[PDB]
Amino acid sequence: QLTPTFYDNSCPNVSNIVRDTIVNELRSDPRIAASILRLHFHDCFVNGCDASILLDNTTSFRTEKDAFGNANSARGFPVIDRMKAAVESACPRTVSCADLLTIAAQQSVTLAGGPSWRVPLGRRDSLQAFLDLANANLPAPFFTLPQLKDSFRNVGLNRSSDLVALSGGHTFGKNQCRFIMDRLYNFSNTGLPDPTLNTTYLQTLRGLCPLNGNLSALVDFDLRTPTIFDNKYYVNLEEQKGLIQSDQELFSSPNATDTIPLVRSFANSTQTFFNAFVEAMDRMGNITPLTGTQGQIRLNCRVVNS
Ligand code: HEM
Ligand SMILES: [Ca+2]
Ligand SMILES: [Ca+2]
């Protein structure tokens, strides 16, 4: 069983070291908090939160960094290396990369203005990386609501609250133009923009992402508060201003009978959202962890101990 007090004796300063690292990084890179939260999400959805995503290529297995959902998208790896080194200095061979990334994600949310809580700890590091599983398990922005639900259920998160609350991670961070081009100019081969996208916002997005333009250009997930972790993400959905298809479907999908009331509840109360986010975050953080003597306490998050 994972427990929040796992390192209270072996490394009481772990959370503070993680926090300090993120605070320093945020000065030069204001997007790092969002990036780190996403790394934890992509770690947990592939064989569980086992730091498998942090592993680099080997001649025996490919890195998850080359998965469609990670390649030229996932970032912050050097920052994780930095805090790991700092933690290894303070507490040699004690804190796993899996736990480190989980704490990093929580501290990132808190630093961005979100809720503060102690995440369960005790996870251990994987002995391999899973590229094929990452390609299969990571959800895509073009997924329909049924597909999004399927993706979450596939890894162990059955609740619509899990999906709606965790999607709130898009209350900050960036998204490439490439992922919304269809919504803007030719949605589902209709030759028309996605009808669930507010027409005024449509114009704004088209200006940021012109047809035949730079597909790697970045746009804010939350037009209200781009870098603050708050419930504004849901207010946007209510006005048909979710950025990607997967965001707006939580409110507009024909299959959203169960998700609409959740979107409204989170848009109506910060407390309700934050409570749900922490609950869902801990559930995601409890996905098939290696514990006890299983796996290792990786010294270098990029490679398995030898
Ligand atoms: C429900 C399905 C989800 C889909 C389809 C999805 C899709 C995406 C896409 C397309 C991007 C843009 C990547 C890029 O342009 O490089 C992204 C970014 C992001 N996602 Fe998600 N996401 C989902 C769920 C989540 C969850 C559960 C979290 C965390 C709790 C999360 C947190 C983030 C953050 C913070 C960013 C910004 C990262 C950065 O700016 O570096 N996402 N997501
Ligand atoms: Ca993983
Ligand atoms: Ca926000």
Tab-separated table of C-alpha atoms and ligand atoms in Angstrom:
chain	number	residue	atom	x	y	z
A	1	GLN	CA	0.000	0.000	0.000
A	2	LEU	CA	1.307	3.462	-0.893
A	3	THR	CA	1.569	5.959	1.978
A	4	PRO	CA	2.213	9.733	2.155
A	5	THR	CA	4.724	9.220	4.984
A	6	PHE	CA	7.007	6.833	3.078
A	7	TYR	CA	10.038	9.153	3.213
A	8	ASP	CA	9.345	10.982	6.477
A	9	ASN	CA	12.323	9.229	8.100
A	10	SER	CA	14.599	8.354	5.169
A	11	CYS	CA	14.302	11.686	3.334
A	12	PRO	CA	12.079	14.272	5.073
A	13	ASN	CA	13.373	17.082	2.852
A	14	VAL	CA	12.442	15.430	-0.453
A	15	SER	CA	9.316	17.514	-1.115
A	16	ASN	CA	11.155	20.754	-0.320
A	17	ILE	CA	14.040	19.862	-2.637
A	18	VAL	CA	11.597	19.103	-5.449
A	19	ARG	CA	9.781	22.381	-4.827
A	20	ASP	CA	12.987	24.433	-4.825
A	21	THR	CA	14.033	22.921	-8.144
A	22	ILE	CA	10.722	23.797	-9.792
A	23	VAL	CA	10.711	27.317	-8.324
A	24	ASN	CA	14.155	28.018	-9.793
A	25	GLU	CA	13.243	26.536	-13.169
A	26	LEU	CA	9.983	28.491	-13.397
A	27	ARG	CA	11.980	31.720	-13.559
A	28	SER	CA	13.508	30.817	-16.920
A	29	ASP	CA	10.715	28.496	-18.070
A	30	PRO	CA	7.159	29.441	-16.925
A	31	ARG	CA	5.799	26.367	-18.718
A	32	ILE	CA	7.749	23.801	-16.673
A	33	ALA	CA	5.053	23.243	-14.026
A	34	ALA	CA	2.567	22.221	-16.721
A	35	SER	CA	5.179	20.092	-18.484
A	36	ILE	CA	6.023	18.180	-15.308
A	37	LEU	CA	2.403	17.430	-14.472
A	38	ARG	CA	1.986	16.027	-17.968
A	39	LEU	CA	5.076	13.837	-17.588
A	40	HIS	CA	3.514	12.191	-14.523
A	41	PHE	CA	0.253	11.649	-16.428
A	42	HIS	CA	2.074	10.011	-19.341
A	43	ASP	CA	4.111	7.943	-16.901
A	44	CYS	CA	1.070	6.609	-15.070
A	45	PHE	CA	-0.920	5.709	-18.200
A	46	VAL	CA	1.799	3.314	-19.377
A	47	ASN	CA	2.388	0.326	-17.076
A	48	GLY	CA	1.592	2.567	-14.130
A	49	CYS	CA	3.569	5.309	-12.442
A	50	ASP	CA	6.910	3.475	-12.614
A	51	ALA	CA	9.128	6.159	-14.180
A	52	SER	CA	9.180	4.076	-17.371
A	53	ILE	CA	8.741	7.260	-19.413
A	54	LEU	CA	12.047	8.619	-18.085
A	55	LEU	CA	14.119	5.803	-19.605
A	56	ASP	CA	16.224	6.493	-22.704
A	57	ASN	CA	16.842	4.117	-25.628
A	58	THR	CA	18.735	0.829	-25.256
A	59	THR	CA	19.472	-1.835	-27.867
A	60	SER	CA	16.882	-4.099	-26.218
A	61	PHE	CA	13.943	-1.684	-25.842
A	62	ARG	CA	12.807	1.609	-27.373
A	63	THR	CA	12.155	4.741	-25.331
A	64	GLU	CA	8.586	5.927	-24.724
A	65	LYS	CA	9.917	9.367	-25.628
A	66	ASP	CA	9.384	8.379	-29.262
A	67	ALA	CA	5.706	7.552	-28.766
A	68	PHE	CA	3.215	9.567	-30.797
A	69	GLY	CA	1.947	11.223	-27.627
A	70	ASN	CA	5.448	12.095	-26.401
A	71	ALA	CA	7.640	12.780	-29.432
A	72	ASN	CA	8.306	16.476	-29.992
A	73	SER	CA	5.844	17.199	-27.189
A	74	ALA	CA	6.852	15.815	-23.788
A	75	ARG	CA	9.443	18.017	-22.076
A	76	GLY	CA	11.200	18.783	-18.803
A	77	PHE	CA	13.390	15.683	-18.653
A	78	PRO	CA	16.561	17.644	-17.747
A	79	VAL	CA	14.716	19.323	-14.871
A	80	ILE	CA	13.800	15.914	-13.468
A	81	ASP	CA	17.460	14.890	-13.752
A	82	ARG	CA	18.376	17.999	-11.775
A	83	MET	CA	16.028	17.376	-8.852
A	84	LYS	CA	16.957	13.684	-8.848
A	85	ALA	CA	20.639	14.580	-8.512
A	86	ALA	CA	19.821	17.032	-5.719
A	87	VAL	CA	17.734	14.418	-3.922
A	88	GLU	CA	20.400	11.748	-4.391
A	89	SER	CA	22.863	14.138	-2.768
A	90	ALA	CA	20.605	14.737	0.231
A	91	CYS	CA	19.381	11.141	0.456
A	92	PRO	CA	21.529	8.582	-1.435
A	93	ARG	CA	19.654	5.709	-3.123
A	94	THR	CA	16.380	6.442	-1.323
A	95	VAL	CA	13.787	8.179	-3.496
A	96	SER	CA	12.619	6.386	-6.639
A	97	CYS	CA	12.221	8.293	-9.899
A	98	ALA	CA	8.561	7.198	-9.962
A	99	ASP	CA	7.900	8.842	-6.589
A	100	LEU	CA	10.083	11.828	-7.479
A	101	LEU	CA	7.982	12.529	-10.562
A	102	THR	CA	4.764	12.120	-8.563
A	103	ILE	CA	5.926	14.672	-5.986
A	104	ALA	CA	7.134	16.929	-8.795
A	105	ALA	CA	3.679	16.825	-10.375
A	106	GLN	CA	1.932	17.687	-7.105
A	107	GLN	CA	4.376	20.482	-6.288
A	108	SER	CA	3.931	21.825	-9.828
A	109	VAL	CA	0.161	22.018	-9.396
A	110	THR	CA	0.553	23.759	-6.031
A	111	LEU	CA	3.173	26.210	-7.322
A	112	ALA	CA	0.815	27.136	-10.161
A	113	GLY	CA	-1.874	28.035	-7.630
A	114	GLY	CA	-3.596	24.679	-7.310
A	115	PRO	CA	-4.417	22.551	-4.250
A	116	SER	CA	-1.740	21.368	-1.836
A	117	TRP	CA	-1.668	17.788	-0.562
A	118	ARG	CA	0.724	14.969	0.323
A	119	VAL	CA	0.801	12.306	-2.379
A	120	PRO	CA	0.974	8.603	-1.472
A	121	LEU	CA	4.532	7.302	-1.838
A	122	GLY	CA	6.388	4.006	-2.053
A	123	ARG	CA	6.525	3.456	-5.812
A	124	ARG	CA	9.562	1.810	-7.374
A	125	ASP	CA	11.205	2.116	-10.795
A	126	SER	CA	10.582	-0.023	-13.879
A	127	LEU	CA	13.215	-2.317	-15.373
A	128	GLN	CA	12.198	-1.406	-18.925
A	129	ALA	CA	10.320	1.136	-21.060
A	130	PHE	CA	7.145	0.453	-23.060
A	131	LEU	CA	6.948	2.240	-26.418
A	132	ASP	CA	4.216	0.091	-27.969
A	133	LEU	CA	2.124	0.344	-24.825
A	134	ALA	CA	2.551	4.134	-24.811
A	135	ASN	CA	1.334	4.363	-28.410
A	136	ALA	CA	-1.676	2.260	-27.489
A	137	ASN	CA	-2.514	3.744	-24.087
A	138	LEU	CA	-1.959	7.502	-24.354
A	139	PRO	CA	-5.174	9.270	-25.415
A	140	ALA	CA	-5.164	11.624	-28.399
A	141	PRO	CA	-6.835	15.040	-28.833
A	142	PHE	CA	-8.984	13.683	-31.666
A	143	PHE	CA	-10.535	10.959	-29.497
A	144	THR	CA	-14.332	10.971	-29.152
A	145	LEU	CA	-15.768	10.987	-25.629
A	146	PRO	CA	-16.380	7.218	-25.777
A	147	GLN	CA	-12.733	6.761	-26.810
A	148	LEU	CA	-11.518	9.010	-23.989
A	149	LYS	CA	-13.577	7.013	-21.504
A	150	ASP	CA	-12.186	3.797	-22.996
A	151	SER	CA	-8.609	5.045	-22.632
A	152	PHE	CA	-9.072	5.918	-18.957
A	153	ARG	CA	-10.912	2.691	-18.153
A	154	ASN	CA	-8.141	0.766	-19.924
A	155	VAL	CA	-5.596	1.878	-17.325
A	156	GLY	CA	-7.897	1.466	-14.341
A	157	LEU	CA	-9.762	4.768	-14.009
A	158	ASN	CA	-13.461	3.875	-14.428
A	159	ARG	CA	-15.016	7.081	-13.111
A	160	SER	CA	-16.200	9.927	-15.270
A	161	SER	CA	-15.051	12.151	-12.416
A	162	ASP	CA	-11.525	10.812	-13.038
A	163	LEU	CA	-11.715	11.912	-16.674
A	164	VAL	CA	-13.359	15.282	-16.090
A	165	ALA	CA	-11.200	16.234	-13.105
A	166	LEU	CA	-7.865	15.142	-14.586
A	167	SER	CA	-8.656	16.883	-17.888
A	168	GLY	CA	-8.505	20.003	-15.739
A	169	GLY	CA	-4.761	19.643	-16.130
A	170	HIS	CA	-5.404	21.695	-19.253
A	171	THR	CA	-6.079	24.737	-17.080
A	172	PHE	CA	-2.508	25.681	-18.026
A	173	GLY	CA	0.240	24.696	-20.462
A	174	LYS	CA	0.639	24.823	-24.253
A	175	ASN	CA	-0.751	22.982	-27.295
A	176	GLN	CA	0.614	22.864	-30.860
A	177	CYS	CA	-1.434	24.204	-33.757
A	178	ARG	CA	-1.145	20.792	-35.393
A	179	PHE	CA	-3.645	19.315	-32.927
A	180	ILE	CA	-6.485	21.729	-33.721
A	181	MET	CA	-6.070	22.324	-37.470
A	182	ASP	CA	-8.977	20.001	-38.233
A	183	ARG	CA	-11.275	21.786	-35.779
A	184	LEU	CA	-10.368	25.083	-37.411
A	185	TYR	CA	-10.682	24.266	-41.116
A	186	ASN	CA	-11.853	20.740	-41.895
A	187	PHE	CA	-13.402	18.766	-39.067
A	188	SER	CA	-14.227	15.117	-39.715
A	189	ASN	CA	-13.875	15.628	-43.477
A	190	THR	CA	-16.814	18.045	-43.457
A	191	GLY	CA	-14.763	20.861	-44.949
A	192	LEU	CA	-16.085	22.992	-42.108
A	193	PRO	CA	-14.800	23.912	-38.641
A	194	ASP	CA	-15.885	21.954	-35.554
A	195	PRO	CA	-19.388	23.291	-34.742
A	196	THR	CA	-18.741	22.925	-31.004
A	197	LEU	CA	-16.010	25.568	-31.155
A	198	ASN	CA	-17.215	29.071	-30.275
A	199	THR	CA	-17.177	31.098	-33.504
A	200	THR	CA	-15.492	34.151	-31.966
A	201	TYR	CA	-12.746	31.992	-30.476
A	202	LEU	CA	-12.567	30.181	-33.823
A	203	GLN	CA	-11.444	33.432	-35.444
A	204	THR	CA	-8.799	34.010	-32.777
A	205	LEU	CA	-7.432	30.472	-33.113
A	206	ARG	CA	-7.366	30.715	-36.915
A	207	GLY	CA	-5.212	33.816	-36.543
A	208	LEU	CA	-2.762	31.943	-34.345
A	209	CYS	CA	-2.900	28.831	-36.511
A	210	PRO	CA	-3.399	29.844	-40.159
A	211	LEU	CA	-3.902	27.125	-42.753
A	212	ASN	CA	-0.536	25.934	-44.085
A	213	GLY	CA	1.138	27.760	-41.209
A	214	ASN	CA	3.658	26.670	-38.582
A	215	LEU	CA	2.054	23.533	-37.139
A	216	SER	CA	4.476	23.552	-34.197
A	217	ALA	CA	3.363	27.014	-33.067
A	218	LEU	CA	2.083	26.952	-29.480
A	219	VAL	CA	-1.282	28.111	-28.145
A	220	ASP	CA	-2.571	28.315	-24.566
A	221	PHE	CA	-4.930	25.588	-23.369
A	222	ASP	CA	-6.750	28.053	-21.114
A	223	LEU	CA	-7.474	31.443	-22.673
A	224	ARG	CA	-8.585	32.855	-19.313
A	225	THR	CA	-5.569	32.064	-17.104
A	226	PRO	CA	-2.851	30.447	-19.307
A	227	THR	CA	-0.433	29.645	-16.464
A	228	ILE	CA	-2.588	29.520	-13.332
A	229	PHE	CA	-3.973	26.236	-12.037
A	230	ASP	CA	-7.648	27.004	-11.456
A	231	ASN	CA	-11.152	25.993	-12.536
A	232	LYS	CA	-11.298	28.441	-15.458
A	233	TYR	CA	-10.771	25.493	-17.814
A	234	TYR	CA	-14.343	24.371	-17.123
A	235	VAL	CA	-15.805	27.847	-17.526
A	236	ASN	CA	-14.261	27.825	-21.012
A	237	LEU	CA	-15.941	24.524	-21.868
A	238	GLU	CA	-19.345	25.914	-20.873
A	239	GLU	CA	-18.811	28.649	-23.473
A	240	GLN	CA	-17.585	26.197	-26.123
A	241	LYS	CA	-14.040	27.468	-25.699
A	242	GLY	CA	-12.226	24.229	-24.931
A	243	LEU	CA	-9.074	24.238	-27.074
A	244	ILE	CA	-8.818	20.654	-28.295
A	245	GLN	CA	-11.544	18.228	-29.329
A	246	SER	CA	-11.055	16.050	-26.253
A	247	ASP	CA	-11.602	19.097	-24.012
A	248	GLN	CA	-14.854	20.308	-25.539
A	249	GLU	CA	-16.333	16.827	-25.822
A	250	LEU	CA	-16.584	16.656	-22.032
A	251	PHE	CA	-19.348	19.244	-22.373
A	252	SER	CA	-20.683	18.861	-25.929
A	253	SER	CA	-20.469	15.154	-26.802
A	254	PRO	CA	-23.735	13.283	-27.415
A	255	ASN	CA	-22.350	10.869	-24.811
A	256	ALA	CA	-21.703	13.614	-22.234
A	257	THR	CA	-24.844	13.063	-20.134
A	258	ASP	CA	-22.610	11.985	-17.257
A	259	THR	CA	-19.764	14.461	-17.805
A	260	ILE	CA	-21.756	17.684	-18.279
A	261	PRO	CA	-22.887	17.883	-14.624
A	262	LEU	CA	-19.269	17.362	-13.547
A	263	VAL	CA	-18.039	20.134	-15.853
A	264	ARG	CA	-20.681	22.477	-14.438
A	265	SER	CA	-19.914	21.527	-10.839
A	266	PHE	CA	-16.197	22.196	-11.317
A	267	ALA	CA	-16.879	25.461	-13.136
A	268	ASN	CA	-19.184	26.569	-10.321
A	269	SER	CA	-16.844	25.826	-7.422
A	270	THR	CA	-13.070	25.950	-7.133
A	271	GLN	CA	-13.317	23.857	-3.959
A	272	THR	CA	-15.340	21.167	-5.720
A	273	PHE	CA	-12.801	21.042	-8.556
A	274	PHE	CA	-9.698	21.037	-6.362
A	275	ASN	CA	-11.167	18.288	-4.170
A	276	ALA	CA	-11.994	16.198	-7.223
A	277	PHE	CA	-8.591	16.848	-8.781
A	278	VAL	CA	-6.716	15.643	-5.706
A	279	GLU	CA	-8.936	12.570	-5.465
A	280	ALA	CA	-8.436	11.749	-9.149
A	281	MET	CA	-4.705	12.532	-9.038
A	282	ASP	CA	-4.173	10.086	-6.185
A	283	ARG	CA	-6.214	7.462	-8.017
A	284	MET	CA	-4.077	7.908	-11.143
A	285	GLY	CA	-0.972	7.804	-8.969
A	286	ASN	CA	-2.139	4.427	-7.654
A	287	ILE	CA	-2.159	2.760	-11.081
A	288	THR	CA	-0.222	-0.540	-11.010
A	289	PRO	CA	2.788	0.592	-8.958
A	290	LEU	CA	5.838	-1.551	-8.262
A	291	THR	CA	6.344	-1.664	-4.493
A	292	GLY	CA	8.333	-3.363	-1.755
A	293	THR	CA	11.288	-5.092	-3.394
A	294	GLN	CA	9.837	-5.025	-6.919
A	295	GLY	CA	11.799	-2.916	-9.379
A	296	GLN	CA	14.569	-0.619	-8.189
A	297	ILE	CA	15.435	2.780	-6.809
A	298	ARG	CA	16.929	4.078	-10.051
A	299	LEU	CA	20.009	6.262	-9.471
A	300	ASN	CA	19.924	7.857	-12.925
A	301	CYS	CA	16.305	8.165	-14.080
A	302	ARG	CA	17.424	7.698	-17.694
A	303	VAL	CA	18.876	4.209	-17.223
A	304	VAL	CA	18.201	1.015	-15.285
A	305	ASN	CA	20.718	0.283	-12.531
A	306	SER	CA	23.497	-2.104	-13.516
B	1	HEM	C1	-8.150	13.293	-21.455
B	1	HEM	C2	-7.161	13.124	-22.496
B	1	HEM	C3	-6.101	13.984	-22.761
B	1	HEM	C4	-5.666	14.285	-24.010
B	1	HEM	C5	-6.212	13.741	-25.326
B	1	HEM	C6	-4.555	15.199	-23.871
B	1	HEM	C7	-3.881	15.787	-24.934
B	1	HEM	C8	-2.886	16.754	-24.856
B	1	HEM	C9	-2.280	17.398	-25.999
B	1	HEM	C10	-2.638	17.190	-27.469
B	1	HEM	C11	-1.374	18.271	-25.512
B	1	HEM	C12	-0.512	19.182	-26.372
B	1	HEM	C13	0.907	18.667	-26.506
B	1	HEM	C14	1.749	19.503	-27.449
B	1	HEM	O1	1.174	20.289	-28.230
B	1	HEM	O2	2.988	19.369	-27.412
B	1	HEM	C15	-1.418	18.175	-24.060
B	1	HEM	C16	-0.726	18.990	-23.166
B	1	HEM	C17	-0.870	19.004	-21.779
B	1	HEM	N1	-1.646	18.103	-21.089
B	1	HEM	FE1	-2.960	16.791	-21.809
B	1	HEM	N2	-4.295	15.468	-22.548
B	1	HEM	C18	-5.220	14.697	-21.842
B	1	HEM	C19	-5.223	14.607	-20.446
B	1	HEM	C20	-4.361	15.239	-19.561
B	1	HEM	C21	-4.245	14.938	-18.139
B	1	HEM	C22	-5.012	13.837	-17.412
B	1	HEM	C23	-3.262	15.756	-17.642
B	1	HEM	C24	-2.749	15.831	-16.339
B	1	HEM	C25	-3.533	15.675	-15.136
B	1	HEM	C26	-2.788	16.544	-18.775
B	1	HEM	C27	-1.923	17.629	-18.701
B	1	HEM	C28	-1.432	18.386	-19.755
B	1	HEM	C29	-0.605	19.549	-19.615
B	1	HEM	C30	-0.257	20.231	-18.291
B	1	HEM	C31	-0.228	19.927	-20.868
B	1	HEM	C32	0.733	21.049	-21.223
B	1	HEM	C33	2.166	20.551	-21.163
B	1	HEM	C34	3.179	21.596	-21.595
B	1	HEM	O3	2.778	22.739	-21.900
B	1	HEM	O4	4.383	21.270	-21.625
B	1	HEM	N3	-3.396	16.165	-19.952
B	1	HEM	N4	-2.376	17.252	-23.668
B	2	CA	CA	4.967	4.344	-16.769
B	3	CA	CA	-6.016	28.355	-15.787
